[PDB]
Design a protein around this ligand. Structure first.
Ligand SMILES: *[C@@H]1O[C@H](CO)[C@@H](O[C@@H]2O[C@H](CO)[C@@H](O[C@@H]3O[C@H](CO[C@H]4O[C@H](CO[C@H]5O[C@H](CO)[C@@H](O)[C@H](O)[C@@H]5O[C@H]5O[C@H](CO)[C@@H](O)[C@H](O)[C@@H]5O)[C@@H](O)[C@H](O[C@H]5O[C@H](CO)[C@@H](O)[C@H](O)[C@@H]5O[C@H]5O[C@H](CO)[C@@H](O)[C@H](O)[C@@H]5O)[C@@H]4O)[C@@H](O)[C@H](O[C@H]4O[C@H](CO)[C@@H](O)[C@H](O)[C@@H]4O[C@H]4O[C@H](CO)[C@@H](O)[C@H](O)[C@@H]4O)[C@@H]3O)[C@H](O)[C@H]2NC(C)=O)[C@H](O)[C@H]1NC(C)=O
Ligand SMILES: *[C@@H]1O[C@H](CO)[C@@H](O[C@@H]2O[C@H](CO)[C@@H](O[C@@H]3O[C@H](CO[C@H]4O[C@H](CO[C@H]5O[C@H](CO)[C@@H](O)[C@H](O)[C@@H]5O[C@H]5O[C@H](CO)[C@@H](O)[C@H](O)[C@@H]5O)[C@@H](O)[C@H](O[C@H]5O[C@H](CO)[C@@H](O)[C@H](O)[C@@H]5O[C@H]5O[C@H](CO)[C@@H](O)[C@H](O)[C@@H]5O)[C@@H]4O)[C@@H](O)[C@H](O[C@H]4O[C@H](CO)[C@@H](O)[C@H](O)[C@@H]4O[C@H]4O[C@H](CO)[C@@H](O)[C@H](O)[C@@H]4O)[C@@H]3O)[C@H](O)[C@H]2NC(C)=O)[C@H](O)[C@H]1NC(C)=O
Ligand SMILES: *[C@@H]1O[C@H](CO)[C@@H](O[C@@H]2O[C@H](CO)[C@@H](O[C@@H]3O[C@H](CO[C@H]4O[C@H](CO)[C@@H](O)[C@H](O)[C@@H]4O)[C@@H](O)[C@H](O[C@H]4O[C@H](CO)[C@@H](O)[C@H](O)[C@@H]4O[C@H]4O[C@H](CO)[C@@H](O)[C@H](O)[C@@H]4O[C@H]4O[C@H](CO)[C@@H](O)[C@H](O)[C@@H]4O)[C@@H]3O)[C@H](O)[C@H]2NC(C)=O)[C@H](O)[C@H]1NC(C)=O
Ligand SMILES: *[C@@H]1O[C@H](CO)[C@@H](O[C@@H]2O[C@H](CO)[C@@H](O[C@@H]3O[C@H](CO[C@H]4O[C@H](CO)[C@@H](O)[C@H](O)[C@@H]4O)[C@@H](O)[C@H](O)[C@@H]3O)[C@H](O)[C@H]2NC(C)=O)[C@H](O)[C@H]1NC(C)=O
Ligand code: NAG
Ligand code: NA
Ligand code: NA
Lengths: 832, 834
């Protein structure tokens, strides 16, 4: 069985780079704390005990309010009067650094104004190993360079607005199946531990880890570790991924929290790099914790060094001060668990004062504008046989497909979006927000047609083919809407347990499009979906005149789409994944059956880096629509490629901050009423063992503490660490590349030039994306696009050196409009 | 068994009043025609033989195009690029003569532009005897005065636009059950003849006939006779309703067409006063006709006098010239039967040249504006506890109910509107048109909220009550949409065979409303329906803060409603019928079982005039909302009632004329150069053998015994005491009393008042009050105006069966003026007038 080697001690923060000031302030405040106050920072107060999906008790004597952590990566979850933004996959489709940023900002502002201190997003894990993985749509793209950039921009947006962002899920949680034992049992499978992602060192550095190096370097304050194991060690106590990869090599200065139910030990996790336990209990409302009381005790009894808990508290405080959250603090002014104005202050046991729990704060501002725009700028025009844009003069418009219309239960009428009814604008699970409203395609397209005095109708029953066929024969244009949905594993829709059972359109989508196209010579297909779908049965139908994929556009869906169809917005989006002929063409199959008895199922990432386009190119398969493909209402020309060659070894000792006293200092204070199921830092009595309640307390302790886990002496700095996102020399710019880009068509719009390299050698992908931008050009206008290649951009990870190395194989650079349309290419000069 | 007494001969046209010129022109052309050409004018060509739901072959030698007759009373049926107007019952709710006229004008422009010569509407039959009758919504109100005025204004708008209007269904077709034999057999009922409406002579004159007198007087070109019998004689060969009441008494100068499949004899119908056979065959596509060839023969063999057939042709041509159809003539430029651009000229058999059958002519102009305005002005505010208008500042709006949402099959996705899915904007059967689009309440209300940056959702599944209650608890206002549908008898939705099985909200509507009201303290109910519904379980709920009835509003439904809810339009509409506590409170039960063995079911109208509010008042029952009830966003005051007495005809007809000549049987044999299209109905004979050309098993059997006395009498006739003018003796229209009252807007917002003038005619078997006059008046805050109207001799009379005339009885009469049939604060005794 795959094995995860140890890396100890857990590196301590050191004020690195842009962290120096936040770090000095965190040290100054943590220095004043008692041990039980530190422990309060590291541990949630129990599932649904307070307002937010995760919440710590804070440090009231020092005026630090409890930290409120709230889903989702696309808008506030479980709340009211908030916006519902387009999914991460749509931000990937925009290929637009500035939009990613502005979406981050607009979400940070909403969260901040609810009294939320930490946003649980954005996501870049799952990266997207498998096209049918249930949560890829929360993240960005199976491409690491595209994902890493947009992930970093999103983070900076949220954090510049004064909310800690949480880069999640770290790492390799690439499928929903078997991700949690209790979940897998509810679906009929008996496993003793969760799915183990088993991945080699080179692949993890070149693909899954790379967007997290970008997040760290961009200054992300939190990381959320994952439910899966990596080589049979749990994500939230994996010393290799946490202490070595994230903290020693990438130099992360912030804090690591567990996923909810992903904390599996007290001492083991603390020593392997975890900093925060969420939601704080061992199972939801168990009234027990692996930390809380247990972490106070582990420090009192000598097993967890004081320097390790000090370091947790300094990381947590430093991320809070880094975004300036102290200056924007207010208790959460809503409840995730009820919409009532009044309620008991502690929801789960219904205890504490009966008081106001929701203030109905409308934090939407004018955010509907960025959502509408982002929706339009993420709508990929995959095919257009001169059918779009529409003019508004079409005499009779047939809107066809349940995906055009309303969810009959209301836009929020499925808990956590857990259905596929009506237009698909948000997929399902925790990566969700309550819509303030939802503009459907039916609404916006019929309003547009009426403004021109046209005739128009929507048929929204996908088995009503007789009515579809009759109307399509009468119509000047048929706009056919289809979808494919997926979501987090705890919800099953039509037997899709989170992951998609297939890549085929839901609700009779293929047959609907064939019924329309059999009867109407101007059939235009609009897809809303979490990822790619199979189009092979109808994409090349002679009456199918255009095809668009619009992802998961959030609240302004119909308007984002009408802006594109009627030419208010010239589509610039490009596909952020591959559209293959068959599911087999993508390989990377999900693990769907037990393969290790009743132990943890083993998910070997045996393809290595060869996922999505890298896998199609390696198998010489031709996609229907390649990664990077999207059309425009204008045309662009790329020409004139020019290339130009451009001109600490040890840590400190681990510090301790403040002092630890006797057990008796940490016994529950006498005047305090203990709320049921609430997790506290205190001890029932000075008897450690009886106050822990742990059946293993004090047994074999030293043989269960890996070697070096309590070593607070100076440590070596790794060859590939010593910076933020890795050694600074990785970011030296070595080669400058330029091209001329001209709009040669008749409509202003955006080009997305893409620069790929070929690093060379028998095991390397033929091409890999490195740079891109999205550039606005009026008709006939030209611009020079210039970009640089870093040392990292030209390197491979060398497992023998434990470092990035520029290999001796000759390298090439390619520039064009997609991963398959690269008319400009050159040999790169040798650089090192 | 009820018996219908004979009345013969069938009165001939005479150029009465405003028909002088059209009759002279009709005479001049019919005088030039051959027998088979005259026959062509009277008989349709066969079910789906040509473009229109009914179509005659015309007179091509004289350049007279075939007459294209097309449904419906609310918009062109079976066509394309036309509008869908609100139903006639919304017109009633507006109480607005001007909107009734403008609706008729916009419909007539559309019909004319499609090359249609005759619109098959409007409808004042069914008047509305039973609140559950399947077609009352096509008409206006169970009140004759309200219906008659709006019927007449509708016909004038249509005719002034150059299209013949058809006042239908004449008469007493008050329910759908048992209306047609083969239809009843499809529902499992074996009957040998159609339901017989049996009604006394006073009742028919005071109620059902009265809007037909207004139609005739307003110059209606055509009348369509009905499927039912009246006292066991079929509507389309009832000499008493046709010869006596319509043609002799009301003085009708135009033509009577059959309902489709309501023609039941050749000789008997022609002599009893039918003028046109639709769709022209005996049963659809039977390639046999009671007229056509049979009528040509019936004249050749001496059974039907030439003067009768000539009078048919003259009535049909006079109606055509009276509206100026000859100046607008074009063949119909669409087909009712396919939407294809090209097809065979003769649809049913797929024969004749292969050519253009559809030109896709966009006839809508800007008619969406009148539709939108009329929907708003027909929205009755029944309850408002200071909940409406909405301001736009509501923070979270819950739109609740399937009736707010789209039909998942598309707005036209149920053939002839034969389902109740999504928002109910049009009821079912032939009284329908294809929507060009349909704006739902969901669309219009969500757009309004988003304009204000509010939050808003629609839940459109009526059994998703868990989602409904959760949202309602979070809402600032809950707008709950409910409906009740019905339609023509040939369609059954959920076991409702045209007529409604009950007056209860469909699709779980009472449970929806209670699930919302149990949870929002600001629940507003919007009803779309064909007629009244039972509101007793929730109307008085403390959390139901407003209730509106919006009828069947046609294509702008959701915008019409938003106009009212957000106060762009102050609702002025008034209930055109009563909202009772129970179904029993209305009495007048439908006949739903065979009550005459396998013979014609018998429908005795034994309540006499006491239908709708007249029945509630007779029984001293309190409606929830009475006839004439509607609220406003302002208040009005009535004062200063005053009454002022004012200072206020051949006795024989001419002999029946003949125009042109009839020749030998050999003049009328099939022309030799002509391909006879299958199923097509022709006026021609196979051979000079009359008997064998007719193919009638009863040809020449006991002929004289089956020709009623007087039936061939072409000599001068007495003018009836109640006849001699248009819609009856012109003395009935003398104005005898002027009434005036001052109406003031005493509130803070402009609005329309609908003053209502009722009379009490006195006497032990008379309704306590009956409506006579009304108008709709726009007043600014504080503004006053003097509303002045006049009572005519007719208005003050009762029908005296012994005199056969209208009489002002000697019981003392009273005038009452106010805002509804129960809110009448002003009263005045009337002085004796005669
Ligand atoms: C001061 O106060 C403190 C606070 O109160 C007191 O703290 C307690 O100290 C105890 C020891 O005194 C702790 O109890 C022991 O816990 C260990 C660790 O369990 C966790 O980690 C397991 C993985 O461990 C590896 O990795 C972690 C880091 O991730 C390392 O820290 C470990 O050292 C170990 O490292 C090796 O492997 C990695 C690669 O993976 C390498 O990189 C390293 O180089 C090393 O080679 C993990 O598997 C555990 O998972 C179990 O528990 C989860 C529930 O928490 C559950 O979800 C999992 O499914 C799994 O369940 C199964 O196991 C448990 C028992 O643990 C059963 O209850 C359950 O029913 C299932 O069977 C977990 O996350 C733990 O391994 C120890 O248990 C082993 O040893 C005891 C005997 O000593 C046996 O009785 C057990 O059966 C068990 O035996 C297995 O392991 C043996 C190898 O070790 C093997 O020989 C056996 O054959 C068998 O396979 C103890 O439970 C306690 O956690 C801690 N409490 C708190 C609150 O922190 C403290 O004692 C006090 N100090 C003083 C001085 O008084
Ligand atoms: C020149 O050319 C012409 C063109 O070809 C030739 O025209 C043909 O003339 C024939 C006579 O020679 C016609 O045949 C006869 O028709 C009659 C009328 O039938 C229709 O009207 C019925 C109601 O009648 C009353 O009202 C009408 C006006 O509405 C009057 O015109 C009648 O005079 C009669 O008036 C009385 O009552 C009213 C009140 O209702 C009073 O106000 C008046 O004061 C009078 O009192 C009606 O009921 C008929 O309906 C039947 O047929 C429909 C299909 O058309 C169907 O939908 C109905 O359900 C119903 O079906 C039942 O009856 C028919 C037969 O008629 C059966 O086939 C069927 O299976 C059902 O049983 C219709 O709408 C008709 O009454 C005559 O038939 C009676 O008498 C014959 C024998 O003489 C019997 O064999 C019949 O069974 C029937 O008997 C009933 O009535 C008797 C009283 O007379 C009674 O004694 C019996 O007990 C019995 O129950 C004839 O069929 C033929 O219609 C006509 N063709 C065309 C195309 O116009 C003409 O001949 C030729 N000239 C010459 C010289 O050659
Ligand atoms: C880890 O995080 C957790 C979670 O955040 C932290 O736990 C929280 O800690 C808070 C203390 O920081 C503790 O707060 C207490 O709340 C009690 C309930 O307050 C609510 O109800 C009251 C009463 O109806 C309302 O007034 C109030 O506004 C709230 O709605 C308060 O009652 C406590 O107030 C007392 O202590 C504070 C100072 O902390 C005084 O200012 C206040 O006047 C009260 O003082 C009296 O009681 C204290 C002892 O508790 C005495 O020392 C003092 O002399 C006063 O004594 C008189 O009155 C008491 C009875 O009132 C009487 O018996 C005596 O004889 C005298 O007459 C305080 O506000 C939260 O409850 C707690 N949360 C939970 C879920 O447990 C935890 O501290 C963190 N740990 C660390 C190490 O940082
Ligand atoms: C009663 O109404 C009936 C229905 O309107 C009348 O029947 C129609 O009478 C007309 C006028 O006489 C006939 O017209 C003829 O049609 C043929 C065929 O026309 C088409 O084909 C040719 C060649 O490809 C094409 O060139 C034409 O433009 C047409 O497209 C012509 O060839 C003749 O010259 C003549 O126009 C109709 O055919 C006929 N219709 C039917 C359904 O039978 C009937 O005349 C009326 N009777 C009375 C007494 O007035
Ligand atoms: C008249 O002639 C046609 C063609 O021969 C024949 O089909 C039809 O049956 C005849 N009509 C009658 C009443 O015989
Ligand atoms: Na086809
Ligand atoms: Na209640």
């Amino acid at each position: 069985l795959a094995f995860s080697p140890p890396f100890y001690p857990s590196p301590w923060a050191n004020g690195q780079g842009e962290w120096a000031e936040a770090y000095q302030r965190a040290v100054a405040i943590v220095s004043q704390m008692t041990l039980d106050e530190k422990v309060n920072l590291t541990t949630g107060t129990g599932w649904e005990l307070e307002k937010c999906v995760g919440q710590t008790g804070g440090v009231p004597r020092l005026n630090i309010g409890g930290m409120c952590l709230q889903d989702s990566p696309l808008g506030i979850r479980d709340s009211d009067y908030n916006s519902a933004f387009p999914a991460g996959v749509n931000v990937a489709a925009t290929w637009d650094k500035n939009l990613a940023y502005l979406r981050g900002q607009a979400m940070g502002q909403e969260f901040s104004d609810k009294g939320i201190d930490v946003q649980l997003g954005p996501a870049a894990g799952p990266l997207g190993r498998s096209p049918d993985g249930g949560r890829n749509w929360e993240g960005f793209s199976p491409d690491p360079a595209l994902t890493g950039v947009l992930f970093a921009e999103t983070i900076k947006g949220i954090q510049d607005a004064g909310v800690v962002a949480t880069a999640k899920h770290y790492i390799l949680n690439e499928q929903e199946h078997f991700r949690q034992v209790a979940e897998a049992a509810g679906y009929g499978f008996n496993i003793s531990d969760t799915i183990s992602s088993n991945v080699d060192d080179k692949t993890i550095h070149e693909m899954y880890l790379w967007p997290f190096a970008d997040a760290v370097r961009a200054g992300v304050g939190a990381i959320m570790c994952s439910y899966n194991q990596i080589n049979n060690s749990y994500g939230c106590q994996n010393s290799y991924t946490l202490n070595k990869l994230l903290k020693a090599e990438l130099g992360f200065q912030g804090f690591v929290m567990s996923d909810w139910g992903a904390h599996h030990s007290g001492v083991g996790s603390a020593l392997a790099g975890l900093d925060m336990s969420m939601p704080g209990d061992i199972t939801f409302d168990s009234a027990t914790s692996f930390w809380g009381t247990n972490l106070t005790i582990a420090v009192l009894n000598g097993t967890v060094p004081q320097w390790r808990v000090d370091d947790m508290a300094v990381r947590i405080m430093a991320a809070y001060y880094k975004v300036g959250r102290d200056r924007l603090y207010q208790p959460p002014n809503f409840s995730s668990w009820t919409r009532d104005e009044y309620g008991f202050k502690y929801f789960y046991p219904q205890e504490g004062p009966y008081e106001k729990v929701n203030h109905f704060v409308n934090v939407q501002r004018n955010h509907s504008e960025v959502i509408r725009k982002l929706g339009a700028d993420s709508t990929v025009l995959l095919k257009n046989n001169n059918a779009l844009p529409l003019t508004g003069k079409e005499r009779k418009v047939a809107i066809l497909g349940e995906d055009a219309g309303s969810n009959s239960y209301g836009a929020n009428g499925c808990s956590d979006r857990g259905c596929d009814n009506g237009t698909l604008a948000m997929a399902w699970g925790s990566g969700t927000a309550e819509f303030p409203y939802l503009v459907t395609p039916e609404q916006a397209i019929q309003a547009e047609v009426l403004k021109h005095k046209g005739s128009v109708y929507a048929i929204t029953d996908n088995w009503a083919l007789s009515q579809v066929e009759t109307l399509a024969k009468q119509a000047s244009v048929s706009l056919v809407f289809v979808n494919s949905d997926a979501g987090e594993g705890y919800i099953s829709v039509d037997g899709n347990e989170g992951d998609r059972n297939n890549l085929t359109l839901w609700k009779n989508g293929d047959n609907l499009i064939k019924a329309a196209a059999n009867n109407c010579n101007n059939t235009i297909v609009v897809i809303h979906s979490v990822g790619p779908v199979l189009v092979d049965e109808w994409y090349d139908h002679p009456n199918v005149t255009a095809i668009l994929w619009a992802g998961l556009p959030g609240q302004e869906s119909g308007n984002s789409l009408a802006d594109v169809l009627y030419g208010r917005v010239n589509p610039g989006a490009k596909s952020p994944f591959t559209w293959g002929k068959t599911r087999e063409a993508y390989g990377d199959y999900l693990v769907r059956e037990l393969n290790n008895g009743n132990g943890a199922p083993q998910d070997d990432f045996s393809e290595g880096v060869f996922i999505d386009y890298r896998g199609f190119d390696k198998r010489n398969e031709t996609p229907i629509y390649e990664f990077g493909h999207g059309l425009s209402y204008t045309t662009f020309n790329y020409s004139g490629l020019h290339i130009q060659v451009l001109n600490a070894t040890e840590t400190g000792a681990a510090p301790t901050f403040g002092q630890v006293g006797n057990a008796s200092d940490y016994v529950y204070p006498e005047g305090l009423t203990r709320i049921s199921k609430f997790i506290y830092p205190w001890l029932n009595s000075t008897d450690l063992k009886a106050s822990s309640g742990d059946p293993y307390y004090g047994v074999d302790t030293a043989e269960h503490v890996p070697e070096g886990a309590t070593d607070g002496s100076p440590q070596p700095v790794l060859p590939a660490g010593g910076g933020s996102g890795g050694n600074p020399r990785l970011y030296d710019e070595l080669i400058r590349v330029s091209v001329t880009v001209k709009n040669t068509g008749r409509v202003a719009g955006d080009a997305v030039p893409q620069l790929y390299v070929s690093l060379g050698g028998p095991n390397e992908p033929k091409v890999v994306l490195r740079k891109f931008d999205r550039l606005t050009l009026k008709p006939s206008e030209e611009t020079v696009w210039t970009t640089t290649l870093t040392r990292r951009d030209l390197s491979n990870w060398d497992v023998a050196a434990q470092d990035w190395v520029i290999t001796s194989y000759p390298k090439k650079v390619h520039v064009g409009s997609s991963s398959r349309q690269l008319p400009l290419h050159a040999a790169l000069p040798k650089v090192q």
